[PDB]
Structure 1
Amino acid sequence: SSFKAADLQLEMTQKPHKKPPLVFGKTFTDHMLMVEWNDKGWGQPRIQPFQNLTLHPASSSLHYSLQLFEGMKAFKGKDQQVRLFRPWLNMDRMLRSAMRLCLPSFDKLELLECIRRLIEVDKDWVPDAAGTSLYVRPVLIGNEPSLGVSQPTRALLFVILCPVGAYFPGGSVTPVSLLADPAFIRAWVGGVGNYKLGGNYGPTVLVQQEALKRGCEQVLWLYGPDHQLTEVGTMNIFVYWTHEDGVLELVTPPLNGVILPGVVRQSLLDMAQTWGEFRVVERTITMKQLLRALEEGRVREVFGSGTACQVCPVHRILYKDRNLHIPTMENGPELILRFQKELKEIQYGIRAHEWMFPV
């Protein structure tokens, strides 16, 4: 069974936060969704003032990382209408994460409505400046007051919101440099890298500091003896090139266990497939193929995809000691600009689309 949006309880706040220089993830809206689960099943969902959590010191969320999260954006169009981008995919992914951690199942459409209801309550937090959005952070945590390692008998689902600025505030895509060092592993086949679980991120903090120490902005996560490019930072990685077989192609790593199935990533594949102008494939990509392709001037554009930026160009990769220039910016970046344009059009209501869910 599941909590129902029909049973939503609303507690409006009596201490409205002073509304706003928006740094991602540091500013929170006035309300939050909160739903508890125990042996009686799910409690009633409530929207309530933004407040601290009270947790037992033995809560399984804090000892054995019984935790998962989601990340999606709500967009305010020119028509002043707020919409969520392909939220159904986030709910699908959230439910898969929950099952992987033996956390309680819920109804994806019910949570979607509760989230819709929450954003409606806090709709005046949704900025409308170009490229801005409201970031939605649903979380599901185990909350058993017990040091045993087992399926929890209690859990907490909550959602908080953050207004965020344009990822490219200059009003144009700015490329990033990547550290590609095979010493670091994000995830492995047989692991849980393909689920959006807190456990996958904690260990990356030190690696990201190492990228900074070596003059890079983000980490290119390599995997295997053959140095497969899997993801970049917290984003999916795409390469637009002419492959060894002479075919112009957009490639991204396949969903074989080490890749988080990004909503933007799936959207880019869907869009590109639909245009039908070039080959679009899911295949592994090795550092050896990339080096060769750069030597032969076959690489046009490399970029990350994710809710944060939508698509972010890469201009450099430090692989061991070798500094590799990636000619993304010298090639438009045509495909990147085309993706941003079409996504912006869809997201901000410029052109009505099944991918958008009205608040």
Structure 2
Amino acid sequence: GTFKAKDLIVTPATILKEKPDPNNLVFGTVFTDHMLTVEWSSEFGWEKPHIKPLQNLSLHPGSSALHYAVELFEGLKAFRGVDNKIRLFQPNLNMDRMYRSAVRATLPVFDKEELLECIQQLVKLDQEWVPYSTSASLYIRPTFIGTEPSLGVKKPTKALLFVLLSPVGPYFSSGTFNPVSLWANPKYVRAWKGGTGDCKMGGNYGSSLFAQCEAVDNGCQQVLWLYGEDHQITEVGTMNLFLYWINEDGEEELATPPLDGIILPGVTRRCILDLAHQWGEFKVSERYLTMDDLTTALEGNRVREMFGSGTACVVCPVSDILYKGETIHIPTMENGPKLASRILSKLTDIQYGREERDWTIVLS
């Protein structure tokens, strides 16, 4: 039916590993002492969850995750506050998105309240892995995979749900904004209408690696995802895309693409539109933006700031775009960046407990 947090079986590790130095962390390469596992079958339903030492998984080579990408994931953080209390940030929005993605993958449904409480107990046991730095955090990685030992393409009769914990340094080791260059080639598409691009399913990511390898060979750090005959700008790598500018009607506007099927609905993207509506100092539009809209705006000095948004960066400014043989400069870093700074400081003030907020949950 569903596993229950109150049925948790806890098997502690006998020897603990030494914590790495917080200002030399490489994202997702170091892992904590413990993981969570929960097994499912169609014959016997959900087994009882386990909290046990990190270990390798024992998989049948026939497992449908390794053959037909029957798999999905999530990404959220835990923050050690300035009062030394550990907090989660909008974790219910992550659980909601994981459930929607499971239905679209035909993985078995689960109680969202029971997963989050299991996850809370996993961080509570391993709580010293949450760094003693207000520029560092602990990444939480829920993962859900088909483990059906057969090659037939179908809805799986077996599955594992597991959670990893990995400490991460600041995205900007400098401590202030390093702007990124983008590779813009219309030859590749990330996601299409009628597709799965608005879910965090593994198969959306496997196909982007060739494009990223090409971006790096041409000196860029990320891909700018183009879509359709009018070259709509959609996403920046695995981050949502925002543009602060004077629009076509002469009005100061913050703009992001709409949730029309090809966009991942980011927790950060939701948080930033809510803040922009509350401040009410400028227009806020979920609308379509093209390479023509952007180059026409730069000719008339109308562009202020371009930045990516996600759990990775919070905010990630853009300085240039390579497109049809030329480098196009974006004046983000010559305009402050005023809005990008204000956003970074507000969201970190909420994350690290410098102000009270509906958006945070203290670990009990």
Under TM normalisation by the shorter chain, which class is it? over 0.9
Name 2:111's counterpart in structure 1: 107
**Aligned equivalents of 1:140 and 1:67: distance in 2?**
6
Matched, 1:5 2:8: no
Name 1:190's counterpart in structure 2: 194
Matched, 1:147 2:147: no
**Deviation, structure 1 residue 218:** 0.5
Matched, 1:201 2:205: yes
Superposed CA deviations along residues 44-93 of structure 1, whole A, max 9, x for unmatched, are 11111001011000000110100000001110101111111101111111
Name 1:30's counterpart in structure 2: 33
Contact 1:97/1:197, CA 8 A, preserved across alignment = yes
Contact 1:130/1:166, CA 8 A, preserved across alignment = no
Name 2:235's counterpart in structure 1: 231
Matched, 1:217 2:210: no
Contact 2:198/2:264, CA 8 A, preserved across alignment = yes
**Deviation, structure 1 residue 202:** 1.0
**Aligned equivalents of 1:232 and 1:38: distance in 2?**
38
Name 2:129's counterpart in structure 1: 125
**Aligned equivalents of 1:185 and 1:47: distance in 2?**
40
**Deviation, structure 1 residue 273:** 0.9
**Deviation, structure 1 residue 97:** 0.8
Superposed CA deviations along residues 270-329 of structure 1, whole A, max 9, x for unmatched, are 111111111111111111101111111111000000100101000001112121100000
**Aligned equivalents of 1:269 and 1:37: distance in 2?**
38
Q: Which runs of 5 or more residues in structure 1 are unaligned?
A: none
Name 1:249's counterpart in structure 2: 253
Matches within 5 A, 1:312-351: 312-351=316-355
What SS does the aligned partner of 2:109 have? coil
TM-score by length of 2: 0.97
Matches within 5 A, 1:165-184: 165-184=169-188
Q: 1:71 aligns with which of 69, 72, 75?
A: 75
Superposed CA deviations along residues 127-152 of structure 1, whole A, max 9, x for unmatched, are 02131000000001111011011110
**Deviation, structure 1 residue 258:** 0.4
Q: 1:164 aligns with which of 168, 191, 198?
A: 168
CA RMSD of aligned residues (A): 0.8
**Aligned equivalents of 1:15 and 1:63: distance in 2?**
36
Q: Which runs of 5 or more residues in structure 2 are unaligned?
A: none
Q: 2:268 aligns with which of 258, 264, 271?
A: 264
**Aligned equivalents of 1:72 and 1:128: distance in 2?**
18
What SS does the aligned partner of 2:110 have? coil
Name 1:16's counterpart in structure 2: 16
Contact 1:3/1:44, CA 8 A, preserved across alignment = yes
**Aligned equivalents of 1:184 and 1:340: distance in 2?**
31
Contact 1:304/1:312, CA 8 A, preserved across alignment = yes
Contact 1:4/1:45, CA 8 A, preserved across alignment = yes
**Aligned equivalents of 1:128 and 1:305: distance in 2?**
24
**Aligned equivalents of 2:259 and 2:293: distance in 1?**
19
**Deviation, structure 1 residue 169:** 1.3
**Deviation, structure 1 residue 355:** 0.4
In the comparison of the two structures, how many residue pairs are matched?
Answer: 359
What letter corresponds to residue 273 of structure 2 in structure 1? L
What letter corresponds to residue 84 of structure 2 in structure 1? Q
Contact 1:76/1:82, CA 8 A, preserved across alignment = yes
Q: Structure 1 runs of 4+ off > 4 angstroms? A: none
**Deviation, structure 1 residue 109:** 1.0
**Aligned equivalents of 1:289 and 1:354: distance in 2?**
37
**Aligned equivalents of 2:221 and 2:6: distance in 1?**
46
**Deviation, structure 1 residue 173:** 1.2
What letter corresponds to residue 232 of structure 1 in structure 2? V
**Deviation, structure 1 residue 18:** 2.4
**Deviation, structure 1 residue 215:** 1.2
**Deviation, structure 1 residue 15:** 3.0
**Aligned equivalents of 2:209 and 2:199: distance in 1?**
18
